[PDB]
Design a protein around this ligand. Structure first.
Ligand SMILES: Cc1cn([C@H]2C[C@H](O)[C@@H](COP(=O)(O)OP(=O)(O)OP(=O)(O)OP(=O)(O)OP(=O)(O)OC[C@H]3O[C@@H](n4cnc5c(N)ncnc54)[C@H](O)[C@@H]3O)O2)c(=O)[nH]c1=O
Ligand SMILES: Cc1cn([C@H]2C[C@H](O)[C@@H](CO)O2)c(=O)[nH]c1=O
Lengths: 318, 301
């Protein structure tokens, strides 16, 4: 009955997302805005040892032809499960607290705002999809992940980043992070997937039916072409039955994708500015966003305790 | 009122007579959603059994086995996970007239997302962190989730596994004991939770009304040192995964099928078990039509 605003800031790495969310949270209150960070200590210590290094080394060895596609795929798939775990778990313990649409739009101020560094679909859809484009994951495994994306509840606000390629390359080339290797092909792949993601949500919200438009696959705003959405990635010989039809297991995975993305509220944040500019731009975007009621009166303190515990335990140390 | 649905998941360890029994019962408003290789996967089952063998011989490391088992389990789970995800919107609340439709499933998503991963953990070929990642991905347990688990003396179970060719499989008695133990602990866990058990309250009992001892549930598996801080406490991320486990399993209705009899008796036993199973309503008048459409299309492949 108190209201909740949830805001997931996501998109390609290297844009300044992590900075922007911290600056926003810093704008004060503490008792009514909390940050759920990238679970770096999960990735690097708790779930497995140095998963980030494992990911970039695995692609490097593939690129150098030191390991096969199949061997790259099993390492990448398994690493991506480690990557997604904290997100999946958080979403699962949060879900029963989330009630109906409240409004924000002409509604009062949230009793609590949670700013997430990334949504579950980052590790369950977007990075797996980019790794597919990089030759280190199979499309079957990507759809296996899709089938496991948790139900999208009301008030799922996703903020995705925009940045010119040239500035983004520059931002990545300056960035130094344990185990990451500078890979401009992966950059291109991940930028593309998140572009497709934005288009997919618009497509679905404009009443798009991927089954209606499937034959059109070949090679804010108006309705996008299915070829500009994520559906375009899954018209691949490995998934096609002896008749050009998608095997039913795969077509159902795409139905799930549509059911998971359609309910999302997407916003685009311009990262081509100062850290404080990015913060205030984000601030403006939030005022209009969809809030929800929570399901119990003790829901707010519990959610707050969850977020702070998560941050302390899995947020970057040292 | 919307028509009623009965969902029945035939699960438990492989090699007990699952498929035979189900095929027999169906051969008589009743539809079988059978086992999915599935859609052209490079025999995952072969790689699973080969990997464990290579591990047991010291040909590959624990870590190497772990990446294969984790990737493999994702592949094995997909058919069940996708089936569950598309059916879910059609499932309404608990009802209690005969069901307009009975769906018999070959397995529940927990087999690939919990039970087999946990058995591989016991076999040293999966990390407990990966097992808890699969747990975190178990779909919310819907109303009327009836799961049938098998009872079979181990020696007869061994005979049954040996009775028929299984391409890619190796008869592994340690794995057989592991999957049997896991399913045994699954049944005890459901009873523990239905009896009001709180793993957080009982956790201290692993270090030394009526319900199973926590030591006889799935919770005992997760006292794994990989999951613990230097002071012995479970990390919150893993503890939250266990809260999730509790919420996934408590709602399930478990029925035990004695497989230690003739195929006819097994069929009959299974039918006997349905009288106590929980039915639900569907959500739309068109639901039954589309579910039968979804089960038919699933059947072709
Ligand atoms: C889901 C999952 C599976 N697996 C592994 C386990 C398996 O090794 C393999 C396939 O797993 P499956 O569950 O899809 O199917 P299967 O293991 O092939 O076998 P099932 O368990 O589906 O059925 P059964 O093996 O019981 O099938 P059935 O052929 O009926 O029984 C075996 C033999 O017993 C006889 N039989 C059947 N009923 C009998 C009875 N009442 N009395 C005496 N004999 C009986 C039959 O004639 C047959 O010879 O993959 C994983 O590693 N990870 C996973 O997540
Ligand atoms: C969330 C996520 C991040 N990453 C990478 C890209 C960035 O280099 C780093 C994010 O901090 O980890 C993945 O490879 N997979 C994922 O699922």
């Amino acid at each position: 009955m108190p209201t909740l605003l949830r805001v997931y800031i996501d998109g390609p790495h290297g844009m300044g997302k992590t900075t922007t969310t911290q600056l926003l949270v810093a704008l004060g209150s503490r008792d009514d805005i909390v940050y759920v960070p990238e679970p770096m200590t999960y990735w690097r210590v708790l779930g497995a040892s140095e998963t980030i290094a494992n990911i970039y080394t695995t692609q490097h060895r593939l690129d150098q032809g030191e390991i096969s596609a199949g061997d790259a795929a099993v390492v990448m798939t398994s690493a991506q499960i480690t990557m997604g775990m904290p997100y999946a778990v958080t979403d699962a313990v949060l879900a029963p607290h989330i009630g109906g649409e409240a409004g924000s739009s002409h509604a009062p101020p949230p009793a609590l705002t949670l700013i997430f560094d990334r949504h579950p679909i980052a590790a369950l859809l977007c990075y797996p999809a980019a790794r597919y484009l990089m030759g280190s994951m199979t499309p079957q495994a990507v759809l296996a992940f899709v089938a496991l994306i948790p139900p999208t509840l009301p008030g799922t606000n996703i903020v995705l980043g925009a940045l010119p390629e040239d500035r983004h390359i520059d931002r990545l080339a300056k960035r130094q992070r344990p185990g990451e290797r500078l890979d401009l092909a992966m950059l291109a792949a991940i930028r593309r997937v998140y572009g497709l993601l934005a288009n997919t949500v618009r497509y679905l919200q404009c009443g798009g039916s991927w089954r209606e438009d499937w034959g059109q696959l070949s090679g804010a705003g108006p309705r996008p072409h299915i070829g500009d959405t994520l559906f375009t990635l899954f018209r691949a010989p490995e998934l096609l039955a002896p008749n050009g039809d998608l095997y039913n297991v795969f077509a159902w995975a795409l139905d799930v994708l549509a059911k998971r993305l359609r309910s999302m509220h997407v916003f685009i944040l311009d990262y081509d500015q100062s850290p404080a500019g990015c913060r205030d731009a984000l601030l403006q975007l939030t005022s209009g966003m969809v809030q929800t009621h929570v399901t119990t009166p003790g829901s707010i303190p519990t959610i707050c305790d969850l977020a702070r515990t998560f941050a302390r335990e899995m947020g970057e140390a040292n």
